[model samples]
Target: MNYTETVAYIHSFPRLAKTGDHRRILTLLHALGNPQQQGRYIHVTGTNGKSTAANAIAHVLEASGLTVGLYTSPFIMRFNERIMIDHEPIPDAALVNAVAFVRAALERLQQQQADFNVTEFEFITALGYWYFRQRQVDVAVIEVGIGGDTDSTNVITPVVSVLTSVALDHQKLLGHTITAIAKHKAGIIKRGIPVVTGNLVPDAAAVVAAKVATTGSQWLRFDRDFSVPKAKLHGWGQRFTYEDQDGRISDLEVPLVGDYQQRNMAIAIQTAKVYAKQTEWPLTPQNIRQGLAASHWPARLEKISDTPLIVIDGAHNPDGINGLITALKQLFSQPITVIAGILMADRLTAAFSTVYLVPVPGTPRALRLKDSWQEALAASLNDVPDQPIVITGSLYLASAVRQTLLG
Candidate 1:
């Protein structure tokens, strides 16, 4: 099939099934020759910062002269953004070929009377591994789609498992409490592998520590093992100092906005250090600096226009919204207009001079907004001309705004 048809077929399945099962993914991968095992992995999972951390690790690996692959979820603009090698999205021909292969494998499994059907995420995960294997990447940084325990991408025993942060998201599917959610995130910790985490809540960190102990995996906490003592806004990005078991790296500049990214950068640095040690790659200070300087993850406080000061952030959950609020406060002093399209009530608590609700393009799941896109834009324009326009809530909304304003 062609690229369009391939994407359509993949999206035909439910984004998430009523129940999640790893067995179906395992069976499908086994039938597809177990492409996940073809290369080493640094598996990353958490409620937030998964994409940033994964992208950072992949960039560092590439800077170390290793061919790297990166797999992330919920692409901001295009489906090809979910899979990448050497920081470039998978080409249309490669994606088409990979999906065709996966479709044939699914057909064979159905013919064999398999009891389970593959979900959209499972198929995408398989396609990532398959495409990475075809490209013969030296290593891959895989991001967990949802809860790490039974997520389709958890099939591999990564060299270094990274958890960015744990917060209340997908509570119905993951769990209700912080500890329960931490347990789900900690599931990526495999026996004897090193696990790195950022600044986690005390209760959540305790749960993760316990999981690491149970699995005999070495625990590397943010403050105890590695710390970011200094992170300050510098120009368009932030510069920070990272200290770890190895040594101290000072004045590391990351182009990605937000102070929380410093913590994510620390996690990526530690993970890259661990991976380098295990794999015997040359991860010098210069490489780390270069990687941090070059690394970029879209839709996290991304500024698309300078005339009206339009910024879009993909902060769907409460924890993510909290981070966005913190960054917004730090970056802007004037009144800000917020355009949100998500249904989560807690996300609406952020302090803003004005709020506009717009329909998120391409999804019926957005909250029922009172104003249309035109109405929202009109209101934003009617506000103080100097006031910045912030469009956030879900990645879908961020993508829609980005396309509308930039395209």
Candidate 2:
């Protein structure tokens, strides 16, 4: 299949697999010769910071003279962005071929198993692993597309499992409370495998601590075990200091903007340190600096335009919004302008100082769409020229706006 057709085919699958099980993904992988068994893995799952941490982990691994494959989901712009090699998106041809391989595995599995089916994320996860194996990567940093315990990405026994943070999100699918959610996030922790986590609240941290004890996994906690002791955020990037039990690495820098990203980078650095120590991988201090400098994830506090600076953030939940609020206070922040009609409309409205809201084409009310994002951008450019603009949404809006800036 061509790239477009391949993507459409992948998307044709259902959005979710059977919750609390991975039999389908495991079956599919068995048919594909268990590609995930090949290399070292770092499984990252959390409410926020997962993407940035995964990206930074892969970058550090690659900088340490290893071929690294990084897999993430809900691409900001392109589908190929989800599967990356050496911190770059897989080429179109690679994506097409990877999808084709996964299709073959599915067909082969369905021959024996009755009513064999896989979800979109499961299929993509399988494709990522097989492609990484085919590319003979030294390690793969896999980001969970959903809750960790039964997530398809959990099939691999990772060298280190990094839970960036546990927050009250994805309640319907995971659970209603932080403990329940943290339990699911701790699902990736394996026997004797090291676990690194962001600074979690007592309620959530207790759940993770229990899991670590159960698995005999070494626990490294942010702020307690390792942390960003100091940092400075700029519109362009961030410079921070990372410290762990062993030593302190100061003046670490990442081109990715946001103070939250500094926390994420610290987690990545700690994970890298643990991974290197366990596997005897040659990860020098200079490599950490080089890799942190190289890591970049788009749409999270990304500056898209200057002079009435337009920044696009792909923050999808309240926890993310809170971080965005914290980050914005440090940067070019004024009355925030939003393209309305987001699912998290209430939270978005409450946080902003002033809002220039543009109702989209389809809203539930009698609202005749007077304006759209482009018009809002125009309005912000003219009306709030002194204040910086932030565009936020999921699924379509924020990403659609970033496409032009990306191109």
Candidate 3:
């Protein structure tokens, strides 16, 4: 099939294979020749910051002269963005070939198991592993599609596991409370494998720490093991100094902006150091600096235009948007216009100079929904004219506005 048809066919699968059912993915991978073990793995799971953390790790590994494959969910703008090797999106032809390869495996499984099933995410996960295997990547940094324990991406036993941060997200599927959610995030921790974590709250930290103890895994907490004591917004980017038992890398710069990003970078820095040591790769502080400086993760306070200061961020939840707000406050002198398309209201409007309640197509409900990204963006452009115009509140809207602006 062509790339377009292949993506559509993948979307045709369910989001999850089946509730409380994990064997489908296992069987599918086995049929595919267990491609996950072809390359080393670094698994990242968290309520937020998973994408940023995983991308950073992959970029650093790639910079260290190793071929790296990076996978993250909810692609912005296009499906190819979800899969990358050495900081480049998979070519259209390669993607088509990878999909066809995985599809062949699924068909073979269908013959052996009458109840053969898979999800779009599961299909994509398998496709990424097979593609990485084909590419002969040195390592792959995979972001969990959702909660960890039963998620299809949990098949691989990673050399190092990173729990970025635990917050209240996907509570319906994960759990009702933070601890319950932490339990699922901690599920990625494997026996004897070192684990790295970001700024988790006391309750959530306890859950992860307990898991580390139970698994006999080396624990590396954000503040205790490593730290970013000095971080400040620095001219359309961030400058943070990362510290750990080894030493400190001062004034490290990342193109992405957000307080959460600083945490994610710190975690990535420490995780990369540990991963390099475990694999006996010659990673230096200079390599970390260069990798962090060169990396760019789209839709995270990504500045598209400098003159008018137009930015787009994929911050859907209150916590995420709140961090975006903080970074905006640090970056801008006056309030700015926010084209928001998310569920929680009131507080966001109060924080911004003007709020355009754009409708996210997949969202169940939104108040004061706008008609189109073009119209809302035009209105914000006309109204604010000077202060930064931010299009945020959901990745879907971010992707739409991104396409409208650049595509």
Candidate 4:
């Protein structure tokens, strides 16, 4: 099969349940000699910042002259964007070959007594590992697709496990309570592996601690182990300090927006420090500073233009929405206009309650609420009759708004 056909086949499934599909991925990996074991990994899982953290870790590791593989989900632009080796998206030829291998393996599985149920995410996970191994990556930074326990990405053991901030998301699949969700995310914590965490709620952090204790794993908590104090906010980027045993490590700048990034960088910085101590790599303070500054993840309070002061953020849930709101205050002081697009399944009321909207006079505040991409984009141009229009909500909705504004 060709690369396009292979990607097409994988996308044909869209998003599927993790129950049966995860096992199929393992079977396929075993058949391919388990390429995931070729190198070490830094697995990142959470309700937010999974992609950003994974990308950051990969960037820092690559800066140290190591070939790092990065695997993230919900591809922003292209299908191949999910799997990248050393900052380069997987080539079409490599994907074509990986897809062909998967097809052949499926045939063999059917012929033998072993049977497998595969999903789109499982196929992509397998493909990423295969490509990483082929490219001889020094390490890989992987992000979990959803709840960690049964997610296909959790099949491989990681040298360091990272859990970013957790909140109420995927209630139906991961459970309704914060503790339940925390337990589900803690699935990536391997035995004896150290788990690094961003700032988390007391209850959520307690749940993670219990799991780590039960499994005999170590944890590096932000509040207990360290903290990052804000230094300055220069547009989407900001500078902060990391406080540890070495005292306050100051003047660390991160390109990501909001106060949340300082905490995220704390987790990344702490993980790097721990990894360096355990491994043979001689990491320097300068390397850590450069890594934090150079790392970039799109659509997180990303400014598309400045004249009208247009900003785009993929703040899908309440936590994300709050962060965007905070970032808005930190970045601009003017009473800014907003464009929002949110999904039907999300808790829009909860998110809205956290935000105070000062929409243009006489326009409906709810008019900014778009259930689909098409509606959201159209709403951006049409001035609501009697309410303020501030764009917020789902990343899809944000994408539509940006596209319409650019056009």
Q: Pick the candidate with the highest lDDT.
A: 3
**lDDT of model 4 at position 153:** 85
Candidate 2: minimum summed lDDT over ten consecutive residues — where? Answer: 361-370
lDDT, model 3, position 4 = 87
- For 1-407, candidate 3 gives per-residue lDDT tens digits of 88889878888996553566567777778888889867799999988889888989987887889998888874476888888888788999998888888888899888887678787777888888888888888998999988798787998889999999887778988889999999888888999999999878988888987898889999998999999999987878878899999989999998887776788899999999999999999998888999998997678788878878888888888777777778788887787888887754677787877888877755566334577566777877786677678888888888877777777
The TM-score leader among the candidates is 3
Tens digit of lDDT per residue, candidate 1, span 259-320?
Answer: 77888888999999999998887799999999988887677788887777888888877677
lDDT of 2 by residue, 82-168 (tens): 888887789998788878877987987778776888888778888888989988888888999877998889898998999999877
The alpha-carbon deviation from the true structure for residue 326 of candidate 1, after best TM-score superposition, in angstroms, is: 2.7
Would you give me the overall lDDT of model 2?
0.80
The TM-score between candidate 4 and the true structure equals: 0.84
In candidate 3, the residue pairs with backbone N, CA or C atoms under 3 Å apart (3 or more residues apart, or in different chains) clash, namely none
Error of 4 at 373 (Å): 8.1
Candidates in order have lDDT scores of: 0.83, 0.80, 0.84, 0.71
- TM-score against truth, every candidate: 0.91, 0.91, 0.94, 0.84
* Candidate 4 lDDT, 227-315, residue by residue in tens: 86545786568777778767777787788877767777777778777766667887777878878777766567766665445566777
Off by over 4 Å in 4: 14-22, 113-115, 344-391, 400-407
Instruction: Give me the runs in candidate 1 sitting further than 4 Å from their true place.
Output: 14-21, 114-116, 344-350, 363-370, 382-386
Q: Measured by C-alpha RMSD in angstroms, how accurate is candidate 1?
A: 2.8
